[PDB]
Amino acid sequence: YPKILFGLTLLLVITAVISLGIGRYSLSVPQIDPVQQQVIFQVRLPRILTALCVGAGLALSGVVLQGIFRNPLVNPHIIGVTSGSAFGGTLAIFFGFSLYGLFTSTILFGFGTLALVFLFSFKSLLMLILIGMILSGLFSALVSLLQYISDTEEKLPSIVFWLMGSFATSNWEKLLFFFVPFLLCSSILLSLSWRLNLLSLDEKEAKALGVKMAPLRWLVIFLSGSLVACQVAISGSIGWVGLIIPHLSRMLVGANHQSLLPCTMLVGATYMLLVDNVARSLSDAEIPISILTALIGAPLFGVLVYKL
Amino acid sequence: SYPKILFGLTLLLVITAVISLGIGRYSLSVQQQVIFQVRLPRILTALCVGAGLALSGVVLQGIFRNPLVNPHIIGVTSGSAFGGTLAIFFGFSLYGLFTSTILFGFGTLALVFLFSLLMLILIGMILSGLFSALVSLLQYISDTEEKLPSIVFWLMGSFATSNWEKLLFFFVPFLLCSSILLSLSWRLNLLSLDEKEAKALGVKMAPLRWLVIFLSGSLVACQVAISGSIGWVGLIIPHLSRMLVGANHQSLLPCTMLVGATYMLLVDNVARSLSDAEIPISILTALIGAPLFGVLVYKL
Amino acid sequence: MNKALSVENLGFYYQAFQQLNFDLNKGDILAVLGQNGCGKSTLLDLLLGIHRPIQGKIEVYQSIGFVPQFFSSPFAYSVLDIVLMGRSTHINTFAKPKSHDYQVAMQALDYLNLTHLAKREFTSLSGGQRQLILIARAIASECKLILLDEPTSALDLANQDIVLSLLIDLAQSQNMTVVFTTHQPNQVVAIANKTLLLNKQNFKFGETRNILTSENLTALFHLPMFEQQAQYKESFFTHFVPLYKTLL
Amino acid sequence: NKALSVENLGFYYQAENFLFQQLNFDLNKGDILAVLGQNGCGKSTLLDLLLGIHRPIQGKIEVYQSIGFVPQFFSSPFAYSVLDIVLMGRSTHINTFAKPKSHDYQVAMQALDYLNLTHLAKREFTSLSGGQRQLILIARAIASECKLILLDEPTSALDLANQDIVLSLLIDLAQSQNMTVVFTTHQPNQVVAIANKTLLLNKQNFKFGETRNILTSENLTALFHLPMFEQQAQYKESFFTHFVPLYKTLL
Structure with a gap:
């Protein structure tokens, strides 16, 4: 086990360093100025760490949600928080809000969605999926409404491209904004590492074992949704991550969550970074990373399924 | 009584059609107003499209033995969306759009076929993902002043630009596909059987299943081709129809077509009456549809 | 041939x-x-x-007819809908069931004395009735x-x-x-x-x-199987009982 | 008591x-x-x-x-191991945000040992037979110390x-x-x-x-809506009673 974690936490660094060797004013042979040094500290490094934490975050969210719903085909989008956040950001863009206004709006409707799912939940697992499905429909329709009634000259293109998400405009201000919730949520979730195994228990056994299913599920849903809301706030809509990463991780360290969470976080971080510095390499222009996670993810998903 | 239900529904369909003439610029009484040559083709388009989407939904739910399935789990709507997007990007003609949409729609079916129940869903999920990625790409690498908004608004289904050309183009496949499915009405019940009984009952599951998949897929591709992406219809209508005439597909299909036609015309009228801004119908089927799905799941 | x-x-x-x-x-x-x-x-x-x-x-x-242990469907098919599926090979691919098909299905329900359940939703029946209806479906196929x-x-x-x-x-x-x-x-x-x-x-x-x-069953079940001739008011028949250690 | x-x-x-x-x-x-x-x-x-x-x-x-429970089945799409399943029985001996300790693994292991299934600890739960699965589920309840x-x-x-x-x-x-x-x-x-x-x-x-x-016989016959009768028997000098259902076709 430790041998696997140490290995994954190795690629993470190796790929991070190698990242410095891509783009304008980069490196080429230095196995680890004055311009290079500034490009690294103010531009490159910020994006590298942002991809790493966002990859770890979306993967984390995917794996814990898969445990809650006892289904490997679940992703951090079934609770409808991604659509809620997408709408929050879209709305902020539509009214020409400020950067901080976008963050608050994105998180506000992101948490707001979780709250709605909770309220309608109290007024089963399948039911949460249905409720979140309803909210996603509502939010994606409102998003469509806004872009339809928005100026096609400047307003529209902004809404459209933000919904694609990328790390092209990542900076130290955003990284630190997301990093706080990220470190918070990931810590609690990691401390509940073992208890997550109890999410697979059935009602009767859970009660006998003193497991408080309801409170536990919601604590995880909230932390899981908080990560995604904050992630969307600083990088837009990114998909096809939480689905395949936990699977690859279970191929490496097994099903016990106590070992799965840390492993999925590490594999997710490296995977996102690899994809992000491909969005740069691939072309002269910045292709939104959402296009790449889908073009890489989907086929990879097939390959992973193919090998039953 | 089954017959009574069908009459009531058909009547309601017509009442809805007339009330439809009392909305808009040159309405009717609650000669210079012969706009019925821009409206009638629209009433007819909404009816046929509603019926066709509902039909695809119910037959797919039968194939997958799941009531939460809709015409978009096989990936045909995504492929079609891409085909029509690829056409706008290259400024094809109206017919170039039709042929491209349909071509990629059919093609997606072929791929799902080649790559081969849960597996079909996973395959359709992959294809749906690639195509969405492609639509996003072409959308990102195009003029944001002419092509971008043109792609974006074609994608979100609408009856705004409905004319006899489109209607008659859709009606042919619509009538052809509906007829075959209706003649397989009772046989659809058999898709609910398990391997052993199917074998005993001499049912050729594979052939039948693919025939239905292609017919419902063809129906959607042609629908997208003339009205864009419209959702939240094939998912709720079969359930409502189910509450009316039951599970037997022989009577479920025609009821579903009638309920779907009237529902679409009904939603269109809500659109036209709420504003003259031509809000795309896809926005309304979701705003009305999602919560309606909720009340439905909340049961009766 | 026999x-x-x-x-x-x-x-x-x-x-x-x-x-x-x-x-x-x-x-x-x-x-x-x-x-x-x-x-x-x-x-x-x-x-x-x-x-x-x-x-x-x-x-x-x-001609073979098959009866599975269960029939699961999220669709609320009626007893008659289920039995009628047995007419599958007597109805052409694109044709609908005819009067004769309903008559035979009804005839199968009559034989089991379950005709009163014809319009009932299959899932509302007991396990016993459901099993009998699936037998009726095989019977309606004429196997x-x-x-x-x-x-x-x-x-x-x-x-x-x-x-x-x-x-x-x-x-x-x-x-x-x-x-x-x-x-x-x-x-x-x-x-x-x-x-x-x-x-x-x-x-x-x-x-x-x-x-x-007892010998064959003991060998087949990997547990001693007791064989005994039981009698019930002039009626006698062989009966087997698995010999659990705790039973002895 | x-x-x-x-x-x-x-x-x-x-x-x-x-x-x-x-x-x-x-x-x-x-x-x-x-x-x-x-x-x-x-x-x-x-x-x-x-x-x-x-x-x-x-x-x-x-x-x-203290009460323990054993369901008839444990279904999970995840490849949990025998030990993983039994260890869950230590649920009440571990704090919400804590991890199981060596003691917890000790109890689970002795639970398996008690049933002579130690040689199954690392096996994938779903690769076991129905009987071993049911026994492993009894072990997890046992590990809870109910x-x-x-x-x-x-x-x-x-x-x-x-x-x-x-x-x-x-x-x-x-x-x-x-x-x-x-x-x-x-x-x-x-x-x-x-x-x-x-x-x-x-x-x-x-x-x-x-x-x-x-x-x-009377209580069972009323319960099963079929005649049921108690029968005596002797197997190698060992006396015992059992009950037989009277199917109409046996007659």
Whole structure:
């Protein structure tokens, strides 16, 4: 086990360093100025760490949600928080809000969605999926409404491209904004590492074992949704991550969550970074990373399924 | 009584059609107003499209033995969306759009076929993902002043630009596909059987299943081709129809077509009456549809 | 001919029984006795033709009807909808059922005295009624050889009793041949004149009077099986009881 | 001393739409109670009530010993290992945000050892047979260190040899480890084999008491709606009783 974690936490660094060797004013042979040094500290490094934490975050969210719903085909989008956040950001863009206004709006409707799912939940697992499905429909329709009634000259293109998400405009201000919730949520979730195994228990056994299913599920849903809301706030809509990463991780360290969470976080971080510095390499222009996670993810998903 | 239900529904369909003439610029009484040559083709388009989407939904739910399935789990709507997007990007003609949409729609079916129940869903999920990625790409690498908004608004289904050309183009496949499915009405019940009984009952599951998949897929591709992406219809209508005439597909299909036609015309009228801004119908089927799905799941 | 089916040197595996031989005559009741996952289920698949035999061959001389243990559908089909599916081979691919099809389906319900359930939702029935309706579906298909997968396993005793009496009646007065899987030796005693003991190791075919013994069952079940002749008011019959250590 | 008490209990069972009333019975340490009934008779609700998932319409339930539960099956799309499943039984011995300690692994291991299944610890739960799976589920309840163990249909889906192992195990838990056992079943021979107390559930009606007082031809015949008769037998000098259902076709 430790041998696997140490290995994954190795690629993470190796790929991070190698990242410095891509783009304008980069490196080429230095196995680890004055311009290079500034490009690294103010531009490159910020994006590298942002991809790493966002990859770890979306993967984390995917794996814990898969445990809650006892289904490997679940992703951090079934609770409808991604659509809620997408709408929050879209709305902020539509009214020409400020950067901080976008963050608050994105998180506000992101948490707001979780709250709605909770309220309608109290007024089963399948039911949460249905409720979140309803909210996603509502939010994606409102998003469509806004872009339809928005100026096609400047307003529209902004809404459209933000919904694609990328790390092209990542900076130290955003990284630190997301990093706080990220470190918070990931810590609690990691401390509940073992208890997550109890999410697979059935009602009767859970009660006998003193497991408080309801409170536990919601604590995880909230932390899981908080990560995604904050992630969307600083990088837009990114998909096809939480689905395949936990699977690859279970191929490496097994099903016990106590070992799965840390492993999925590490594999997710490296995977996102690899994809992000491909969005740069691939072309002269910045292709939104959402296009790449889908073009890489989907086929990879097939390959992973193919090998039953 | 089954017959009574069908009459009531058909009547309601017509009442809805007339009330439809009392909305808009040159309405009717609650000669210079012969706009019925821009409206009638629209009433007819909404009816046929509603019926066709509902039909695809119910037959797919039968194939997958799941009531939460809709015409978009096989990936045909995504492929079609891409085909029509690829056409706008290259400024094809109206017919170039039709042929491209349909071509990629059919093609997606072929791929799902080649790559081969849960597996079909996973395959359709992959294809749906690639195509969405492609639509996003072409959308990102195009003029944001002419092509971008043109792609974006074609994608979100609408009856705004409905004319006899489109209607008659859709009606042919619509009538052809509906007829075959209706003649397989009772046989659809058999898709609910398990391997052993199917074998005993001499049912050729594979052939039948693919025939239905292609017919419902063809129906959607042609629908997208003339009205864009419209959702939240094939998912709720079969359930409502189910509450009316039951599970037997022989009577479920025609009821579903009638309920779907009237529902679409009904939603269109809500659109036209709420504003003259031509809000795309896809926005309304979701705003009305999602919560309606909720009340439905909340049961009766 | 008096034969209903015959199997010769049958051998099969899914990925990895062998030399299996037996034949049935019309009107016979065959019980394939065994425990879960020990072959009996796969045997039925072979008799239906769902899978090609790796070795040997199977010959069926009568129209076959099949009865699964359960019928699950999220759709609320009625009893009649379910029985009518049995008319499948009498209705062309693009045709609809005709009057005759409803008459035969109704005739099958009449025979089981379950006609009053015709408009009921299948899922609202008890397990016993559901099992009987699935037998009616096979009957409506007009098969002469009926194969049943664990027809009594999930039913309560009174319904198991109804099924057992029905199977013997199908064979004795409706000219049918019956093959059913089971793990209950006393039910084989009750209605089967022939039995096939299936183990993931070996097997034995023959008349029930010769094959159903404490020795064979003890060997088949891996637990001592007690055989006793029980009597019930002038009526005497053989009965087996598994000898659990705690029972002794 | 008392292990469990059920007084004037009344509850509804949706499935069969029937209301049970004034149910009474108590169990002491070391008792083995069999709840005999047929498919969907209220066993589900009964167990739910004993574990307190929900409150009953009338009556009270008091449990005096730590309670453990064993479902008939454990279904999970995840490749959990035997140890992973048993360890979950340490749930109440680990704090919410804590990790299991060496002691927790110790108890789980001795639970497996007690059942002679140590050589299964690393195996993938779903790769085991039905009998081993059921035994592993009893182990996880054991690792929880409960004194009152409730089992839902522990033998119904197992082959005969494994049902035998389970019956012997339950007797050993009650007689040697002073545990109290409650299991559901539809098999009267298994009831006379190991249960000193039995509860018969028949359409809103029931009967509780000493097994020999309850397991009679008359009570079973009324419960099964088929004639059932007690039969005596002797196998190699060992006397025993069992019950035989009288199928019309046996005649």
